[PDB]
Amino acid sequence: RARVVCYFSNWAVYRPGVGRYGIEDIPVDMCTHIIYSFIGVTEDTQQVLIIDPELDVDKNGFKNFTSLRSKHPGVKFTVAVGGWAEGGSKYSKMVAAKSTRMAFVRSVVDFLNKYNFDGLDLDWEYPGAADRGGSFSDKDKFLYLVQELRRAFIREGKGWELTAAVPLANFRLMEGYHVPELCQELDAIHVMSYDLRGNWAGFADVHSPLYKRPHDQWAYEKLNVNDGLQLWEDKGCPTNKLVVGIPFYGRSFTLSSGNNNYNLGTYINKEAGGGDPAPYTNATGFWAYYEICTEVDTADSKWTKKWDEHGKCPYAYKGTQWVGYEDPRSVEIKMNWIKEKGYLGAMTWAIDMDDFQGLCGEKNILIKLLHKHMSAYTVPPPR
């Protein structure tokens, strides 16, 4: 009854060579819930925006995805609206009034019916965030949207799921999320317990530390997976609604010139924007798990791999390059911690970045860990 929630990126199919990952590559039986990412919202009409129509519609992307339920009827196939690239301003604008919310709600219902989805994952990042086109009134109005969506889903009578991806920083929770009311309306809370550190922070660190490190201070003091999930509990979310995010990727850094200190918290060349782009994801500061293991784990690797004794995460470095991530050891530790705490399950960003080709060893090594632990785990009643 535990969840293994797998986010699927629709843009992964455009990755070159062995990086190419499509619908056919999803290891469906390893997941209980799979989420097609992303659709968006229109700026002008507050309707569902199909972001890659040639792929999603013309090449039958949405339907290929949902029709996987024929072979795997026990699995839920939903769609995510929002995501980082979508921005937050269109969503703050959409929830501003009742009329615009209901226009979106109607569009959502039409979309879900048309492409046979089992429900919707809300990924607005984030309500109430000034840095993301939000404002104070987003907190109330995001709740209104969620309540209105739930009632519409009930009226359709198909038992659709409604979930949300959420941050874990206290200031983000205060600005955007009525926790008790939201957790009541939602089937699951997908906590984005990653990207907690990165180039934007101005120092090298692992991005999903489980526990606090000595160097964690001020805003970073409770910015770890354990304290972050505890925060969601303390604000009123039941343990059996919380799903813990696991990143299948690393946040990389370019160290400052002449810096021979590779410890956690060491200064970086922030202007570089992060570590150099990897060949398949081609993104500064962002390396897929398979891009990391093919570099760090090889027999003649010149990378030095270390372990965060407090955060329970691996990091590795070579020359000016430094990356923090998750490996089988850290993932296993998090799986046991999830069961220890009694949370609803595990979530991954994203399934397309596991070692699905088995370049470094066994195929889909990370998702197999999530499946192994969660499938043998019974979610206890709310604490």
Ligand X SMILES: N[C@@H]1[C@@H](O)[C@H](O[C@@H]2O[C@H](CO)[C@@H](O[C@@H]3O[C@H](CO)[C@@H](O[C@@H]4O[C@H](CO)[C@@H](O[C@@H]5O[C@H](CO)[C@@H](O)[C@H](O)[C@H]5N)[C@H](O)[C@H]4N)[C@H](O)[C@H]3N)[C@H](O)[C@H]2N)[C@@H](CO)O[C@H]1O
Q: Among all residues, which ones are annotated catalytic?
A: 125
Give the residue, chosen from 23, 288, 323, 335, that forms a contact with ligand NAG under the rule CB under 6 A: 23
- Nearest CB to ligand NAG, comparing residues 22 and 88: 22
Using only the alpha carbons of the chain, give its radius of gyration: 20
Alpha-helix runs per DSSP H in the chain: 53, 61-66, 89-94, 98-114, 138-156, 170-176, 179-185, 225-234, 289-296, 328-341, 365-375
Positions 330 through 369 that interact with ligand X (CB under 6 A): 349
Binding mask 26-55 for ligand X (x = CB under 6 A): ------------x-----------------
245-304: which residues touch ligand X (CB under 6 A)?
A: 283, 286
The CA distance from 262 to 264, in Å, is: 7
d(CA 211, CA 235): 19
Report the C-alpha gap between 163 and 189 in whole angstroms. 6
Query: In 3D, which of 287, 293, 335, 326 has the Cα closest to residue 307?
Result: 326
Contact letters (x/-) for ligand X, 7-26, by CB under 6 A?
Answer: ----x--x------------
Under rule CB under 6 A, residue 55 binds ligand NAG:
yes
Binding of residue 169 to ligand X (CB under 6 A): no
**Smallest gap from residue 245 Cβ to ligand X (A):** 7
Should residue 85 be labelled a site residue for ligand X when binding is judged by CB under 6 A? yes
CA distance 315 to 82: 30
Write down the least CB distance from residue 114 to ligand NAG, Å: 16
Q: Which of 22, 61, 83, 119 binds ligand X (CB under 6 A)?
A: 83
Contact between 200 and ligand X (CB under 6 A)?
Answer: no
Q: Out of ligand NAG, ligand X, none, which partner does residue 84 contact, by CB within 5 to 8 A per kind?
A: ligand X
Rank residues 21 and 286 by Cβ distance to ligand X and give the closer one. 286
From ligand NAG, ligand X, none, interface partner of 230 (C-beta below 5 to 8 A by class): none
Tell me if 60 contacts ligand NAG by CB under 6 A.
yes
With 0-12 / 13-18 / 19 or more C-beta atoms within 10 angstroms meaning exposed / middle / buried, residue 69 is: middle
Q: How far is the CB of 154 from ligand X (least distance, A)?
A: 26
SS3 37: strand
Burial letters for 239-248: b for 16+ Cβ neighbours within 10 Å, e otherwise? bbbbbbbbbb
Min separation Cβ 298 and ligand X, Å: 25
Q: Name the nearest CA neighbour of 370 among 211, 250, 245, 249.
A: 245
Q: How far is the CB of 81 from ligand NAG (least distance, A)?
A: 19
Residues of span 251-280 touching ligand NAG by CB under 6 A: 277
CA distance 35 to 8: 6
377 forms part of the interface with ligand X (CB under 6 A): no
SS (H, E, C) 249-299: EEEEEEECCCCCCCCCCCEECHHHCCCCCCCCCCECCEEEHHHHHHHHCCC
**Pick 84 or 267: Cβ nearer ligand X:** 84
Q: Taking the mean position of all CA atoms in its chain, how far away is CA 235?
A: 21
List phi, psi (to 5°) of 40. -130, -160
- Asked if 129 touches ligand NAG (CB under 6 A), the answer is no
Cβ(241)–Cβ(344) under 8 Å? yes
Binding site residues, ligand NAG, CB under 6 A: 22-23, 55, 59-61, 64, 277, 282
Binding site residues, ligand X, CB under 6 A: 11, 14, 38, 83-86, 123, 165, 192, 195, 283, 286, 349
